[PDB]
Ligand binder design. Structure first.
Ligand SMILES: OC[C@@H]1[C@@H](O)[C@H](O)[C@@H](O)[C@@H]1NC1CCCCC1
Length: 467
């Protein structure tokens, strides 16, 4: 019982995908390797079914059909990402501009506009050119800032006359934590048997992201935003963190758990330093901002994008690592009673009021002028052995989105200036360390044959958007 009239005249309803998960054609039209091609090819064991995004779901050859399907659902906007290494094979500008590369994105952009679909573009969705990881360690070096900044500038120039929404980075917490603390994600650093140091590297990498983030945002405000009349921001993820009980020890835990996950990026962009509790507890292992980078980081975004899957309970805790540095034990149970229904892999619990609380908190802690819910979606098992006819009827996903839009409407009613909701995965796609064992899509993809077919959630979505 949520209808489009309950939202402002002015809200956007979209869906999204990313380049490495969707595009495929990894070795076609002169794309250079990313760290995800490498991770996935040199480390198949690190991938649950040893699969990869070589072909992924083949969006690079099927974009016309895919746009057709977007228009059939009535998407108002589609969020996608540019593969850095599809436009610049070696990351830097010395190694070339790939014109096959840039023709693909012009084709893909013009086709979205021809079908009334507004394009919203991410610069960096984890797919770092492998040449830059090789040369100087990617985000392990400050050298990434200028290289990212030229990639950004090329993108503003080459595409920016048709595009109004720009995101610098999607989930740098996941990229930094899962890539350098846990060794789960490219480049596979910091866990047992991996190169790296999970106590150092996650912090260096996040510092270099925030500086990279800032150069691109200054590029855009100073050289592109008056002519192109668009807006630039960053995508932050967080779980909501509920106190296990209503004792101060647990409130202190919530505030540290949020701080290490959301404040780590959002406190630089509000006051120009990391949060209090990160400085206390990580100490010399947390880099300092210059007085110039600190001052220039205040307000450095036009919007915050917020990705949200779930909530956990939080209480005080009992080898140094980013994983242990907040001091928070997380559990999904209270008195053996889960905080909401447990989905396929065991991590995601449907918790709609988690969204509400996480959007109110971001506004009272950071005073964000413009919020978007940039990823909101549910995981489902990839069940081989059933007919597409049963796989299609994903009533649980339609109820999922309904309830979260309820929370998103509730936050708007309590003054949070949230301006959009974007269903995560439009299409079933490649799922990083889980390869193809699950699905988040509202359109079904046969992972092998690439055929597309709408689930019932897509048709619920079409109907909702048309209200
Ligand atoms: O559900 C995971 C979604 C991915 O589909 C998407 O590419 C990414 O933005 C998001 N990642 C979440 C962040 C924490 C680790 C896995 C969940």
């Amino acid at each position: 019982v949520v209808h489009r009239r309950d939202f402002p005249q002015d809200f956007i309803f979209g869906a999204g995908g990313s380049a490495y998960q969707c595009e495929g054609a990894y070795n076609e039209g002169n794309r250079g390797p990313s760290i995800w091609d490498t991770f996935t090819q040199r480390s198949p064991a690190k991938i649950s079914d040893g699969s990869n995004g070589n072909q992924a779901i083949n969006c690079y050859h099927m974009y016309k059909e895919d746009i057709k399907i977007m228009k059939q659902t009535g998407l108002e906007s589609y969020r996608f990402s540019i593969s850095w290494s599809r436009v610049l094979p070696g990351g830097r500008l010395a190694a070339g501009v790939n014109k096959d590369g840039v023709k693909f994105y012009h084709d893909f952009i013009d086709e979205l506009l021809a079908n009334g679909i507004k394009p919203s573009v991410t610069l960096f969705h984890w797919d770092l050119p492998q040449a830059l990881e090789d040369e100087y360690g990617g985000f392990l070096s400050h050298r990434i800032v200028d290289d990212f900044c030229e990639y950004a500038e090329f993108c503003f120039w080459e595409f920016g006359d048709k595009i109004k929404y720009w995101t610098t980075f999607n989930e740098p917490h996941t990229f930094a934590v899962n890539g350098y603390a846990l060794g789960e994600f490219a480049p596979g650093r910091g866990g047992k048997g991996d190169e790296g140091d999970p106590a150092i590297e996650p912090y260096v990498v996040t510092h270099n992201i925030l500086l990279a983030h800032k150069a691109a945002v200054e590029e855009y405000r100073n050289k592109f935003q008056k002519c192109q009349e668009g807006e630039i921001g960053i995508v932050l993820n967080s779980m909501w963190m509920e106190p296990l009980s209503d004792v101060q020890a647990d409130i202190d835990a919530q505030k540290r758990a949020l701080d290490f996950m959301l404040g780590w990026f959002l406190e630089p962009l509000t006051t120009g330093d990391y949060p209090k509790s990160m400085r206390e507890l990580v100490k010399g292992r947390l880099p300092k901002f210059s007085a110039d980078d600190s001052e220039k980081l205040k307000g450095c975004y036009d919007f915050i994008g917020m990705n949200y899957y779930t909530a956990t309970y939080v209480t005080n805790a009992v080898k140094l690592s980013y994983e242990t540095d907040d001091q928070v034990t997380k559990t999904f149970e209270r008195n053996q009673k889960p905080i909401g229904h447990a989905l396929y892999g065991g991590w995601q619990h449907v918790v709609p009021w988690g969204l509400y609380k996480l959007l109110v908190y971001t506004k009272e802690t950071y005073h964000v002028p413009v919020l978007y819910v940039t990823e909101s979606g549910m995981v489902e098992e990839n069940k081989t052995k059933i007919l597409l006819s049963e796989a299609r009827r994903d009533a649980e996903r339609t109820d999922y989105h309904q309830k979260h839009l309820a929370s998103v409407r509730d936050a708007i009613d309590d003054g949070v200036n949230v301006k959009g909701y974007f269903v995560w995965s439009f299409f079933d796609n490649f799922e990083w360390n889980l390869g193809y064992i699950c699905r988040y899509g509202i359109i079904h993809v046969d992972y092998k044959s690439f055929e597309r077919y709408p689930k019932e959630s897509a048709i619920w979505y079409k109907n909702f958007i048309a209200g």
